[PDB]
Nucleic acid binder design. Structure first.
Ligand code: MG
Ligand code: MG
Ligand code: MG
Ligand code: MG
Ligand code: MG
Ligand code: MG
Ligand code: MG
Ligand code: MG
Ligand code: MG
Ligand code: MG
Ligand code: MG
Ligand code: MG
Ligand code: MG
Ligand code: MG
Ligand code: MG
Ligand code: MG
Ligand code: MG
Ligand code: MG
Ligand code: MG
Ligand code: MG
Ligand code: MG
Ligand code: MG
Ligand code: MG
Ligand code: MG
Ligand code: MG
Ligand code: MG
Ligand code: MG
Ligand code: MG
Ligand code: MG
Ligand code: MG
Ligand code: MG
Ligand code: MG
Ligand code: MG
Ligand code: MG
Ligand code: MG
Ligand code: MG
Ligand code: MG
Ligand code: MG
Ligand code: MG
Ligand code: MG
Ligand code: MG
Ligand code: MG
Ligand code: MG
Ligand code: MG
Ligand code: MG
Ligand code: MG
Ligand code: MG
Ligand code: MG
Ligand code: MG
Ligand code: MG
Ligand code: ZN
Lengths: 68, 157, 105, 208
RNA sequence: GUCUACGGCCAUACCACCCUGAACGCGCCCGAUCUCGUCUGAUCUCGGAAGCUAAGCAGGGUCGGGCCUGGUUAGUACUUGGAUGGGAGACCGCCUGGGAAUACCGGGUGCUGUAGGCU
RNA sequence: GGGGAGUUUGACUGGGGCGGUACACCUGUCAAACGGUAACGCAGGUGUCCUAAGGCGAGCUCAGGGAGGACAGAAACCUCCCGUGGAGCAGAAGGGCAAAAGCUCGCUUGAUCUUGAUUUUCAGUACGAAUACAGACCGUGAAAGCGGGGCCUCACGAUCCUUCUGACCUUUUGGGUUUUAAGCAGGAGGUGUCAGAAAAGUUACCACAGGGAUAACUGGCUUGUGGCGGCCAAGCGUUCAUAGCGACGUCGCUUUUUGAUCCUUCGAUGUCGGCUCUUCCUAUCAUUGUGAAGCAGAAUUCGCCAAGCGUUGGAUUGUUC
RNA sequence: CUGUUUAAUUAAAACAAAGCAUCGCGAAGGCCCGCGGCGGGUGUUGACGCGAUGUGAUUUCUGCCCAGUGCUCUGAAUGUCAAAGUGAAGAAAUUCAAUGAAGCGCGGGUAAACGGCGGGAGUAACUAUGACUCUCUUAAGGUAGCCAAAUGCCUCGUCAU
RNA sequence: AAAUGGAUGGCGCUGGAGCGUCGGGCCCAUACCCGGCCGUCGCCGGCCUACGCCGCGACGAGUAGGAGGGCCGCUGCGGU
RNA sequence: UAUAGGGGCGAAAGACUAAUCGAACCAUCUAGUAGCUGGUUCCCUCCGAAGUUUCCCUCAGGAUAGCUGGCGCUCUCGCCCACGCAGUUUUAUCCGGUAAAGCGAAUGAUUAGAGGUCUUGGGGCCGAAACGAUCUCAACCUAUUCUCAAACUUUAAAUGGGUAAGAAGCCCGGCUCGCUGGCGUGGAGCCGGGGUGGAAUGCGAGUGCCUAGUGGGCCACUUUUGGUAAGCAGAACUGGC
């Protein structure tokens, strides 16, 4: 009882009925697969930022506000 | 039944061009690749360490990871049903920059320069592109020379 | 294949490359009261008859060769198993082959 | 042997004899030049051509029969050693046959019916020359009649044409007698060598 | 107008032959005691500076061979879409668009990135 | 211990069986210049080998050819020259490689540990294979660097059970010690029908549910084969191609043979031959009227309009023949 | 031969038959029935008997093979070998060791037990075919008979009627 | 040259009712345009059963299958 | 009168055993199981397919994905400018090895002629024989010449594949790093104020859950594999039943 083996007929119609839209592009996609050393350095820079940010950046903001 | 394989059917795709065999040129190594730049993929046969799959040949994608001898590229591979954003780790031997992004950057620089320069003069410059418009009415010239008559040649075997 | 009898390899216990001694691995005999043999015996006992199946249709010709690496450092006695690809003929210790030899038959 | 009706058109890709056939019967034709091969280029001025009008296949046996007919007519029309014929078409496409049940339904119907090679044919395109004959200036009607006789033996539909070229060379007949006088064409047996101007000066010093 | 050291493009810059090279530089070249290695100081290594552009090398030339580019081949072979177009078929023509290569001919044959010595 | 009882008799398949594995995995074409794409489509392979044929560093350049040297001869060894891969890289092919991935030399096991993410068939599940990292210990070179197997594309295996390795680990049930057992992680013992049941044959004494998804009848599509014609004309025909044939080639009709496919028929179309009987077809055996011969007559051979009329009696064979 | 056979598609060449052979058994036995008993059939029986097979009037013939598959017999010289029993180690579970009943393996016999019975080369004063001979094989190579048979594909074999 | 008598569809057609190139008219589909009516959807409008009453526009085929409405229908029970 | 159902009986046909015998009849398990046939009941309205991927002792089936429907939910227009999307085009940008073409270019096949001969082999000539000399053929080389390659290729189309055409972007200043490091070097992260009109056309989009049916297809223009061919078997895009 030989039958049909494999065809791709009437497949593009099934695909285009729902759509072949591109994947959802969003900001801050992901951080997976990134170098572990680079990720560790980024975490350290993010967690040590508020130590010196809230003072020197505030002083510079006051200075630029006095400038303009 | 078609003998699916990792390098099936790349006899002419992964081969080096004619009169271009030998060691790799050193200019392709000194190129800088940062995160977020749009690059292209072209499989090279000189090295076989980090070559991509035959389905990503000629594909353009952005870089999301950088390492010592390779780069991570997010490629939009169209599977039968939809498109998947796949992360691929390929060495720098098979990657080159995309001039489309460079042309776009040059165009946006020209635009933000032209507008900044014309704001003072008050001239509303048309920096937005357009399609090729139909040519306007022009005046040809014959300078007294009569147009040459064209006649179809008789058939000859 | 041919393998060396002694090779300095990373030791899991002390965390350092120590000279281990390579020997052949022999599958130990399955002793009784192993919680699988007891269950098998209790299942076979009775009038049922061959509760568990016996494997037929053997296809694999040879097995995978594994080596027992034992660390020679005193008061360490670290033992490990190292597997290699399948092979028909395996030889534990022999002379090294050379080039420009006297292979004349 | 199967008739020529079933091996007329071009239905399959070229299947030449190579390392993948590993078996093929020998062709029917063995010789392509039948006139005087040692003739010079100034011996036979004109030349005819059998140009095919249909894109089909020509069998080597048909080529053999047609060239035998042409030679038999020519050696009687203008005598032996007075012409030069050439079958330009060469057979390389190998047609395969599938012998059917060596007569009973015991054997397989179409299971593994790739078949074995049967013979060799020649693929001809529209406008491709099959045969070409060179003779003297007065044997025009004789060449035309020989090509007409070969037409009745070749299948399909092919016409006759007397080319403006000089013999077998790619040069015209009008620009040949004046270009061979001065050093621009060198006759070498049945062919002519065209000497270009972009060569070393020693080749020009050797002449003149 | 040139070379050396390090390099990008990787024959417009490779191959064979023939001419020129002033002042630096490259090299040829002279010698094995120490560093070093072979049968051999030929090659690789520490000592040079008696001669040389003979060679490499750098330029120029060949109605030179290759390489690049441009005409010819040619709107030709092909090809997207169309017809109730032709033909018995094989195949072909038309409309709307894109458009190849070999013969043949003509032109070129290195340009530059950093440090340095000369006329 | 078939005396008796239970159960099984792989799948694909131009019907089924036999044949073969297209059932697991690769190379080139098929494949229509992204990827993908079938047939019992083509041309081939694999279930291994390597303590080096892995890694590093250095040196050298291969196959072949040209001209010479005592035995030396086509091929022994030495020297010079040409030598862009025409050799070699373990094995089937494709790609790739020249101070190299090829040969030689010296040290070496990175062919060792560990957690993730990613690529490949993909349902984007697993196995296998592979990529780039990261964390410790080492190899190598002076060093930049390379190496966590073979230059790349295949060379291999779930659950349960068994065995081995490690914690100076967890539980062994009212509380302690010990043997033992169970428990965590990773290596092996196999499912080649290779995402993995433990399996012989016959039934013409056969039964059941179904199938025209699937053979043995007919009919239908093509005519390879069979039969029947045409064209060319090398030759036979004492002479002479075509009175009569006509090779080498080539173009057509037929379903009165066989074969190819399985479209209707499986809740049945009663499947060989013979006897009796009707009608039709013409590619005419004879008869009516004709043309041509190598037609003296007679007897013959080749065609034309031509199916109106006939085309028998028996021996053996079920026989068509 | 007489006889019997598929009631309701077969009457036979089938079955049966006397005859011819072979096997087991001397009764605490041979062949069988039986869930059970020293329960039952042969057996109110005893080798001229019982039980199990093959061939199938009379005559003459009963060829050769025990290699294989079956049957049977032998010696604790001899290999494998379960429970149970013995010794040892261990605190014990447990482990090891010594010995080892039938059977299997080894050897002999048996084919009126199942069965089988090949293939090359040189040799006659017309030549061939072939008297005769050499050689591989396994256990032996179709002897006496008979035939295109109810057994022969080629085959509608060849010759005579 | 093929077997029941028979197929440009038939009758028939030859200054065409045949072939090739064409012109002006004409014939009709559930297609197009205009208009009425029914339903769905969207937008809605109003402080007239709000689960009701209106307005505009665009669309309506369909096996297997999935939903919504029924003031369609049969039986029995609690209210009316 | 004795033998009663895996039993009896059988001069053996697997025949007979109450019209049933290659395993009787009666009742129960039992409404045994069936991937297999047949059937499956009222109206209207709306939406509306698949015969395809992978796996299975899988091929008359099932699971998975895909196609479909329902329930929603989150926003956007409606009073010089939109978020976003597209079976499409335009502009830049690479990717490829088909059609075609070539082999007086690599590899493998391939017909014939012309010249030169270093050597090799076969013939004829001078003549004790002799690379002492000569004519010719085969072989080799050179420059041409005819015809081909789905598993050849220098070159190389059309069609076609991916990306980009902005506010998720650019310019400026300052902080953090245990990452790297001559250097306040490089690279990432964060903060702060200033500047939207960025190719054409068309359109409202995004997302969650549940889910039936399907899992035998066929035909056509064109490109194609096996076959002589088939209303034959097997593929790619599109359309149709
Ligand atoms: Mg199917
Ligand atoms: Mg027991
Ligand atoms: Mg020394
Ligand atoms: Mg020394
Ligand atoms: Mg020296
Ligand atoms: Mg010099
Ligand atoms: Mg000089
Ligand atoms: Mg030149
Ligand atoms: Mg077209
Ligand atoms: Mg049984
Ligand atoms: Mg089957
Ligand atoms: Mg394609
Ligand atoms: Mg492709
Ligand atoms: Mg090296
Ligand atoms: Mg290879
Ligand atoms: Mg190669
Ligand atoms: Mg590391
Ligand atoms: Mg499987
Ligand atoms: Mg059975
Ligand atoms: Mg019977
Ligand atoms: Mg059918
Ligand atoms: Mg025929
Ligand atoms: Mg049929
Ligand atoms: Mg009937
Ligand atoms: Mg009937
Ligand atoms: Mg009649
Ligand atoms: Mg009786
Ligand atoms: Mg009867
Ligand atoms: Mg008794
Ligand atoms: Mg008798
Ligand atoms: Mg006997
Ligand atoms: Mg015996
Ligand atoms: Mg005991
Ligand atoms: Mg004799
Ligand atoms: Mg005899
Ligand atoms: Mg007799
Ligand atoms: Mg009529
Ligand atoms: Mg409508
Ligand atoms: Mg509807
Ligand atoms: Mg009512
Ligand atoms: Mg029973
Ligand atoms: Mg009865
Ligand atoms: Mg029963
Ligand atoms: Mg029921
Ligand atoms: Mg299926
Ligand atoms: Mg949906
Ligand atoms: Mg290809
Ligand atoms: Mg081609
Ligand atoms: Mg079919
Ligand atoms: Mg089909
Ligand atoms: Zn250790």
């Amino acid at each position: 009882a030989k039958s049909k083996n494999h065809t791709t007929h009437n497949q593009s119609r099934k695909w285009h009925r729902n759509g072949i839209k591109k994947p959802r592009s969003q900001r801050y996609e992901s951080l997976k697969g990134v170098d572990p050393k680079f990720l560790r350095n980024m975490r350290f820079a993010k967690k040590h930022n508020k130590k010196g940010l809230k003072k020197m950046q505030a002083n510079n903001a006051k200075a630029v506000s006095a400038r303009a | 039944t078609n003998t699916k394989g990792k390098r099936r059917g790349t006899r002419y795709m992964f081969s080096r061009p004619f009169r271009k065999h030998g060691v790799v040129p050193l200019a392709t190594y000194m190129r800088i690749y940062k995160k977020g730049d749009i690059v292209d993929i072209k499989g090279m046969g000189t090295v076989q360490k980090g070559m991509p799959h035959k389905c990503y040949h000629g594909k353009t994608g952005r870089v999301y990871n950088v390492t010592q001898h390779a780069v991570g590229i997010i490629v939009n591979k169209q599977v039968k049903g939809k498109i998947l954003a796949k992360r691929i780790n390929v060495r720098i031997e098979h990657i080159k920059h995309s001039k489309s992004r460079d042309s776009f950057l040059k165009r946006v620089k020209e635009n933000d320069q032209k507008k900044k320069e014309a704001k003072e003069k008050g001239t509303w410059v048309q920096l937005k592109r357009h399609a090729a418009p139909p040519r306007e009415a022009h005046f040809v010239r014959t300078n007294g020379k009569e147009p040459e008559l064209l006649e179809p040649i008789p058939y000859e075997f | 294949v041919n393998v060396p009898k002694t090779r300095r390899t990373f030791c899991k216990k002390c965390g350092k490359h120590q000279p281990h001694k390579v020997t052949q691995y022999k599958k130990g005999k399955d002793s009784l009261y192993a919680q699988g043999k007891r269950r098998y015996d209790r299942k076979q006992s009775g009038y049922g008859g061959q509760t568990k199946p016996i494997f037929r249709k053997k296809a694999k010709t040879t097995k995978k060769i594994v080596l027992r690496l034992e660390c020679v450092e005193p008061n360490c006695r670290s033992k490990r198993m190292l597997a290699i690809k399948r092979c028909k003929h395996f030889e534990l210790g022999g002379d090294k082959k050379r080039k420009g030899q006297v292979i004349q038959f | 042997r199967r008739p020529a009706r079933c091996y007329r058109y071009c239905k399959n890709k070229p299947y030449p004899k190579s390392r993948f056939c590993r078996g093929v019967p020998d062709a029917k034709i063995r010789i392509f030049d039948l006139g005087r091969k040692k003739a010079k280029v100034d011996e036979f001025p004109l030349c005819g051509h059998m140009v095919s009008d249909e894109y089909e296949q020509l069998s080597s046996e048909a080529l053999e029969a047609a060239r035998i007919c042409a030679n038999k007519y020519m050696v009687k029309s203008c005598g032996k050693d007075g012409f030069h014929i050439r079958v330009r078409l060469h057979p390389f496409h190998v047609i395969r046959i599938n012998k059917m049940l060596s007569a009973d339904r015991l054997q397989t119907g179409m299971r593994g019916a790739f078949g074995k090679p049967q013979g060799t044919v020649a693929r001809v395109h529209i406008g491709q020359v099959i045969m070409s004959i060179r003779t003297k200036l007065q044997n025009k009607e004789h060449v035309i009649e020989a090509l007409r006789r070969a037409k009745f033996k070749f299948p399909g539909r092919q016409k006759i044409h007397i080319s403006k070229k000089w013999g077998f060379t790619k040069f015209n007949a009008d620009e040949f007698e004046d270009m061979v006088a001065e050093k621009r064409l060198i006759p070498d047996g049945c062919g002519v060598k065209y000497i270009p101007n972009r060569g070393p000066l020693d080749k020009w010093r050797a002449l003149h």
